[PDB]
Design a protein around this ligand. Structure first.
Ligand SMILES: Cc1[nH]c(C(=O)N[C@@H]2CCN(c3ncc(C(=O)O)s3)C[C@@H]2F)c(Cl)c1Cl
Ligand SMILES: [Mg+2]
Ligand SMILES: [Mg+2]
Length: 194
């Protein structure tokens, strides 16, 4: 329990104690804000010149999956924490703290790295699970029903409106929204402004 790891746990406690101060509310608006917090990272990575595709999927039981083709969150052991950079970044994430479960897959160094968390707490050390010829970041998360008491069900039209807006505002980025909650009836909208 180093000073860094203690700071992490205190940070998770603070976010879960007063979630509304971080994401505005714990209502339906707050639930959808989780998606924008993650997608904003991918947008910045695109604007920095390293990504051009973002995919948002509403998966079974209202998991959200966000994928980009950026550089991938770094996995090198950093100086401050002595932990992989990706773990440090995600253990300070408000979305992670307010999710009952969160998973990351980083495609980087021709390797796929995986870590999972519950309420921000890593469930195991970052591990290599496969290989890849792509780079990018995949985040899957399930909003915490203890925090989001009114609803944990996403509204497709709400996500659609803002995703369309984000593509219009950030030209060149292909942004795709897909609803896979009903496997028999799957909806997809893909936006790409020139
Ligand atoms: C979905 C998603 N995507 C990103 C993301 O793309 N983050 C970038 C990845 C590249 N970064 C690098 N930092 C240092 C790098 C290096 O090579 O040293 S690459 C900056 C952000 F972390 C994040 Cl964070 C999330 Cl969450
Ligand atoms: Mg960033
Ligand atoms: Mg493009």
């Amino acid at each position: 329990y180093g000073a860094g790891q203690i700071q992490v746990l205190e940070g998770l406690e603070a976010v879960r104690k007063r979630p509304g101060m971080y994401i505005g509310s714990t209502s339906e608006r707050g639930l959808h804000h989780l998606v924008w917090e993650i997608v904003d990272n991918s947008i910045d990575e695109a604007l920095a010149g390293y990504a051009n595709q973002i995919e948002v999927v509403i998966e079974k039981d209202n998991w959200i999956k966000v994928t980009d083709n950026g550089r991938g969150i770094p996995v090198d052991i950093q100086e401050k924490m002595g932990r992989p950079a990706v773990e440090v970044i995600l253990t300070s994430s408000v979305v992670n703290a307010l999710s009952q479960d969160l998973e990351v897959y980083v495609h980087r160094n021709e390797t796929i790295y995986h870590q999972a968390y519950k309420k921000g707490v890593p469930q195991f050390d970052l591990k290599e699970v496969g290989t890849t010829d792509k780079t990018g970041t995949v985040i899957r998360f399930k909003a915490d029903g203890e925090i989001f008491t009114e609803t944990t069900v996403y509204n497709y039209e709400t996500l659609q409106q803002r995703i369309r807006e984000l593509a219009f505002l950030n030209k060149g980025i292909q942004i795709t929204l897909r609803d896979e909650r009903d496997e028999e009836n799957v909806r997809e909208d893909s936006y790409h402004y020139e």
